[PDB]
Amino acid sequence: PIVQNLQGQMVHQAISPRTLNAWVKVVEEKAFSPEVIPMFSALSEGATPQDLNTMLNTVGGHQAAMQMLKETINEEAAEWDRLHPVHAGPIEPGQMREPRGSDIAGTTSTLQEQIGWMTHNPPIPVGEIYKRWIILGLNKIVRMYSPTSILDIRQGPKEPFRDYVDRFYKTLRAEQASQEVKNWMTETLLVQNANPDCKTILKALGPAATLEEMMTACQGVGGPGHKARVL
Amino acid sequence: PIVQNLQGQMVHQAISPRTLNAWVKVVEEKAFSPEVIPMFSALSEGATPQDLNTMLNTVGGHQAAMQMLKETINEEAAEWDRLHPVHAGPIEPGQMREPRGSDIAGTTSTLQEQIGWMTHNPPIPVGEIYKRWIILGLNKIVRMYSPTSILDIRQGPKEPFRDYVDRFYKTLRAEQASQEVKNWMTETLLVQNANPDCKTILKALGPAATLEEMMTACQGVGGPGHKARVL
Amino acid sequence: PIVQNLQGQMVHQAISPRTLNAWVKVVEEKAFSPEVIPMFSALSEGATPQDLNTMLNTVGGHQAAMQMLKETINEEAAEWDRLHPVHAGPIEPGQMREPRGSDIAGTTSTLQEQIGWMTHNPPIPVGEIYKRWIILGLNKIVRMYSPTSILDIRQGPKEPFRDYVDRFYKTLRAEQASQEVKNWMTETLLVQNANPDCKTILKALGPAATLEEMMTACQGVGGPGHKARVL
Amino acid sequence: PIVQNLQGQMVHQAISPRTLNAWVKVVEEKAFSPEVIPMFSALSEGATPQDLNTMLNTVGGHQAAMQMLKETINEEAAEWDRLHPVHAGPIEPGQMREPRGSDIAGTTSTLQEQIGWMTHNPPIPVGEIYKRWIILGLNKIVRMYSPTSILDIRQGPKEPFRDYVDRFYKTLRAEQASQEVKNWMTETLLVQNANPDCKTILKALGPAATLEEMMTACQGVGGPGHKARVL
Amino acid sequence: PIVQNLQGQMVHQAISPRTLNAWVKVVEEKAFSPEVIPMFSALSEGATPQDLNTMLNTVGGHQAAMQMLKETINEEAAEWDRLHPVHAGPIEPGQMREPRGSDIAGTTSTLQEQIGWMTHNPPIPVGEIYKRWIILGLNKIVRMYSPTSILDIRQGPKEPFRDYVDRFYKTLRAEQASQEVKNWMTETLLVQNANPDCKTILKALGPAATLEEMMTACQGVGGPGHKARVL
Amino acid sequence: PIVQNLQGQMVHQAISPRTLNAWVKVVEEKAFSPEVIPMFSALSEGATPQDLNTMLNTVGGHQAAMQMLKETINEEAAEWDRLHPVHAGPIEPGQMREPRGSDIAGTTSTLQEQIGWMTHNPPIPVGEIYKRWIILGLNKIVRMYSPTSILDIRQGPKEPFRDYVDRFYKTLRAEQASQEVKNWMTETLLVQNANPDCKTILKALGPAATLEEMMTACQGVGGPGHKARVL
């Protein structure tokens, strides 16, 4: 990784292998749940492409999904090669070469080379770009492997609103369709697939009613207060 | 995180996945509680608004909680909107631009602008501002996860004052009413829903008497259904 | 806490959450036992009032004992407030005002200000005074848990004196009895209800003995359990 | 190792027992998996040849395997001596000299010379060469005691495609055949040993198509839902 | 404990709850065995009496033992008063006072007296004085609660000499008698209580060979099953 | 123990009982074993001779070999002391004395001077000498506890040159058998009861074939060695 807030010059610094074992622990235990991606976002911060392949390639398991990840990163590399014109040397003797797509994967590049483009005036953030390609591919892997579908989250007759919301959100989180697509569902579908006791407050009483009145909706067996269950 | 320092200039510091993994170990295995609030408060000390977000976005479980937390912040963001001036003349120097409420909450702002506002004279304490707005959504969660309802608890007929007080005090604290109301729970309701030996001792002891005597009451007695006392 | 202890150069450092979480687990597992009291003293060493408030209120242990521990902080600050009458209240740009009861607990006050009384000449011992208010509150909770009966610990005719001496020193650690009340019990409990062969030996010794002499005594019971030199 | 990032990068740090225990656990779970080579690359960041020897003899299990690895070290160490005619400078330690393949494997060298060499201008990268020799013996064991032959795996009779390729890509990963054979096995052995109506889909999609289109196919083989993670 | 020795700026530190949880697992495990005497004596070199009273009162079990430790300390605090009275010569304002034996055990002294005496030149080391009454205390508990005799150990018929010699040296360490007597014990009892076939091997080996020779001879009687008994 | 992260200044901290205990945790659980020696090196770099004396005397187990090691660390002191000319100074302000046998072991030395020597420029490394002395005692306990009699390790009559490896190389890790007589073990004894096909491969290549060449020889008997090493 590269560190530049301890003193004002960039210096390279080793990865802790314990953290790698913890990232392995989180995808070994929790798999393709959309919550894992935060640990990786924290992992990949302030990295090089050499740190990034180490991070991608420490996950030994899940190789269909890693091979889907590998296809997504090859297609962004390949996009990068056809969106530029074809020459890639220094503009003038003694200036540096231009980043290729494969250099961004650290494939055809070495640590000093990647870091001199990161420290140059102006720099090219090849590490943050390679992290994007993984992060797209993680967002892809969570959706592909989600067991539930966001239109068919439907509220039972014995299920609290808070329990419905816990099923809806996680599934909504793991689905990869757009932000406004996602907000539009929370105006529509969230109401639509609610049980009539919850839906009755959400349609008729609307914006006027308290947040609390909605979150304690469809929980009235035994009156106020939350109900202890082992599940 | 950030390193404010004794006489040096304040400085940014490298992300910890081990803090992050450690934080949601409480959410996953202890759940949300008044007891989380000073651990979260000590854990989120020295944190930027972006570190605060990384921590909250990690949380996978608890999504009717997470939605209660987002909504409860949107009131205090929109409160920040009208406090902010319509016109007051020229923007201060030594700061990148001037924030609005989303820029406080790390939402729209870059980690340079955030530390920029801290480094300006005087400081804008964006992450300390935000740190309460989370605690308010935390407060709201505490009132949606309460399972003891302050009227309908009582002391059982021969049950310890030690266990009753634990019963009444931990309920009282999560109840969201004014202190004058909270004092009425302890003045009236308390006595009343206590069994006759614990009220009778409390009636019998004077105002400068020991609480070590009150706190041992009702251990090895028969109470209603089993007594021989006429009162 | 404060670091550079007792040296003319003291500076505050935030408590690690790992340290705090060690104090939360120490408290949840060992509970309000005699053992945990000096464990609190270590952590209290150079704690501020503002750390001490965190330590007291972050813990998920029995609340009726915590409420009497808090009610001793309230008794001790109205006593201090009784001890020193205080002239002139807070003013906005002021410094080095007199410390009220509320402020020594850290309630009406802020970190920089608490620091101000500790770095004064000669220094106020702001956390020590509050620290002593907690230690009393601890000691009172041990008297609530005390065995009802000292006369039903096992003290029959085969029960050995060293194991009985544990049974008694644990019955005493809970009671916390004065040297004049212990002098009554060493004769007419301890040495009286010793097993026959050991009490014959203890009748020759007499009960005014030291523990070192009492433990040295008892060679003439069968086997090696009571002997001080073993063949 | 040196993990130093401030100053002249010269201050050596001791490797930790705790880290070497977390490493020893990985060998206990997964000795023969290629997810170990990046964990071990991550553990050998910044190592001296003393440290590399400490880490090689920390593993106690897999006797024949770590004595294959040591065979492999000694072969390259002897390769090195007939690759280089005439080693420059003293034949004895502790004066300016060319490290032999034995000084490189740490055997005739000292930490004192190993730091001299790594701190030289240009730096002589003894802990990196010694790393690469361990990596070459480690890959050979990892391929040698691999559990799966690529040829003998097949799809199961009422089995999905998703768990069949979960194994096939992971098996193609520690495969010893070169990329041109690896693409023939992808091209042929995948779709040869696929079950008949998936073979249908495979050939209908063709080879150039995204893997993601194939990962959503052959799911009605598993039928109705009955075992996935609860939201 | 006192840290940062020999730079010209001594520092004091405090003991973390996680350290304390580790300490009292170890002291309650090894209370009656000599194993405890090095642990205490190492931590004395860096401990104030306030540090040593922390290590004493956190242990939490063995009340006859651990209190008799404290009685021994107050016994030897009394001794100190009449072996050296404070202040035989002059005394004046601004001069550092002589320690009393209650100032040694920390009971009457402040922490600044205790660091002040220690950090003088030639030093007054009150931590090293207090360690004598501690180590005496430790020998009194392990002497009284260890019933183990050097006079009942022996080698059975199928017992390895290495197994007998290891138990004998462990019971030798436990036995409190001066080295010249122990040299006698090895001379005599160790040959005398050895197994006849092996008293013959030692008669054939003679008296002037090494400890390595006795324990590597005379082994392997235990059928196939011998491997469980010896390492 | 000492720690240093920066040039030309450092921090001696007091010995953790947690880290003392880890060493005890390796000895109590795994005893004397090859991997004690790595772990012990990784631990002991920052340790003073007083740290190392604490680690030895805290052992409670394996007491006869702790004596064998005590004799070994003492005779190495004697060999260091005897074989350099003696000109043994006193404690002299601003002059460093010449380490002698007893000084290297802490015996006739004190904590200031142990930091002194270890942290000079160029260093005087007494704890690095003292490491090697302890190590040389430990090779003897291991060599006693490890297997022996390389001649008696035979191949089953139905074995296909394949399963002897793990006991055979454990004995060769224990002490190295010389290349001619290890050829002779292989040619004369080891292959003697073997199938004709394995006897034809072993004689063609010679007794000194690679462990890679032999484990990939004799294919498809189904004998000894046809089990998984990790499952």
Give a description of the structure.
Chain A is mostly helical and 231 residues long. The first copy, chain A, has helices at 17-30, 37-43, 49-57, 63-83, 101-104, 111-118, 126-145, 161-174, 179-187, 189-192, 196-204, 211-215, and strands spanning 2-3, 11-12. A two-stranded antiparallel sheet of chain A has the order 1-2. In chain A, a hairpin with a 7-residue loop joins strand 1 (2-3) and strand 2 (11-12). In chain A, helix 4 crosses helix 7. Chain A is elongated, with a radius of gyration of 24 Å. The two termini of chain A are 42 Å apart. Chains in contact: A-B, A-D, B-C, C-E, D-F, E-F. At the E-F interface, strand 1, helix 1, helix 2, helix 8 and helix 12 of E face strand 2, helix 1, helix 3, helix 4 and helix 6 of F.
Instruction: Give the topology string of chain A: H per helix, E per strand.
Output: EEHHHHHHHHHHHH
What helical percentage do the residues of chain A reach?
Answer: 40-55%
Proportion of residues in extended strands of chain A: under 5%
Biggest interface, which chains? E-F, 39 and 38 residues
How many H/I helices of chain A? 12
First-last Cα distance of chain A: 42 Å
- Sheet with the most strands: spatial strand order of chain A: 1-2
Radius of gyration of chain A: 24 Å
Biggest sheet features of chain A: 2 strands, antiparallel
Structural class by SSE content of chain A: mainly alpha
What is the strand tally of chain A?
A: 2
Subcellular location (chains A, B, C, D, E, F): Host cell membrane; Host endosome, Host multivesicular body; Virion membrane; Virion
Organism (chains A, B, C, D, E, F): Human immunodeficiency virus type 1 group M subtype B (isolate NY5)
Subunit structure (chains A, B, C, D, E, F): Interacts with host NUP98.
Family (chains A, B, C, D, E, F): Belongs to the primate lentivirus group gag polyprotein family.
